[PDB]
Design a protein around this ligand. Structure first.
Ligand code: 25J
Length: 290
């Protein structure tokens, strides 16, 4: 099974095989299973269950090829693989800040920590992911699942850098059911016609922006997948998250334009995030205290 990215072909032989003896698992991180490990290089170890089908094996190899071929500061690095021993491993850059979805919920301003997060922290996370999305767009790669659950943070503190850390949906499409599709992150032409372009990621980026500025709420509060599908197809859009500055909400509503041609590309999105970052009326807005 070969892989093509940016018109360059790669195969399992191009993956960096790390000797199994050099790898130590330290603790579980979540669910196959994921561990924090060591090679010393700190890594996140993605495992392939030994009890798997041949399709699961090919999917695992395809995931390794996809991540290893990217080269961008906002896309998780692949340290290598351990495919010559069972269970097979994919070794990723250990993102000590964990997933973005959990970070937003755990780091929400509270009476004990009123300034735990500010608008600038959120704008920096949005810029970081938009930079990763821009890299994918300029290399003609469609992510198909831009969402907070798929983003990682280098550290919990102010110097944190956000990165795209999962490419499962893209791997599946490269090569399954409607109840597993990320309906709440998809534009109308994607769930209706199965039409995917770089403008599909623009729409999903708008939804991720809402997730960031809501501090980790599930999109379309109280709506099921089919309710969202009918709502979005009929022109319905989410309200601004609590205390969301107008200029930031305006980026979201532009990402959610019905026609893909009316949605901005990632260069324009980055330009608009930069302007929000400069505006004192935006960054001086206090986040809600839960
Ligand atoms: C495959 C996995 O990758 C990583 C995960 C983490 C991580 C994640 C959560 C907590 C903590 C850490 C680290 N320490 C924590 O406390 C760090 N770095 C990674 N490379 C991943 C990639 C993604 F995009 C989304 C989710 C997951 N995930 N979360 C669990 C299982 N799977």
């Amino acid at each position: 099974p070969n892989y093509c990215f940016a018109g360059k072909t790669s195969s399992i032989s191009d993956l960096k095989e790390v000797p199994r003896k050099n790898i130590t698992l330290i603790r579980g991180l979540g669910h196959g299973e994921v561990y924090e490990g060591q090679v010393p290089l700190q890594v996140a170890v993605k495992t392939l269950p030994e009890v798997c089908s041949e399709q699961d094996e090919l999917d695992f190899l395809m995931e390794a090829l996809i991540i290893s071929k990217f080269n961008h500061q906002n896309i998780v690095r692949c340290i290598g693989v351990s495919l010559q021993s069972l269970p097979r491993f994919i070794l990723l850059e250990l993102m000590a800040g964990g997933d973005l979805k959990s970070f937003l919920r755990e780091t929400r301003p509270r009476p004990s920590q009123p300034s735990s997060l500010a608008m600038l922290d959120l704008l920096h996370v949005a810029r970081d992911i938009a930079c990763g999305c821009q890299y994918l767009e300029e290399n003609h790669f469609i992510h198909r699942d831009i969402a907070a659950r798929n983003c990682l943070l280098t550290c919990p503190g102010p110097g944190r850098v956000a990165k795209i850390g999962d490419f499962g949906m893209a791997r599946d499409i490269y090569r399954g059911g409607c109840a597993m599709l990320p309906v709440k992150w998809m534009p109308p032409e994607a769930f209706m016609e199965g039409i995917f372009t770089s403008k599909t990621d623009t729409w999903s980026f708008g939804v991720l922006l809402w997730e960031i500025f809501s501090l980790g709420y599930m999109p379309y509060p109280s709506k099921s997948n089919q309710e969202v599908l009918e709502f979005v197809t009929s022109g319905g859009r989410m309200d601004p998250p609590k205390n969301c500055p107008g200029p930031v909400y305006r980026i979201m509503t532009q990402c959610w334009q019905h026609q893909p041609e009316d949605r901005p590309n990632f260069a324009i999105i980055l330009e608009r995030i930069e302007y929000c970052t400069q505006d004192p009326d935006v960054i001086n807005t206090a986040l809600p205290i839960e």
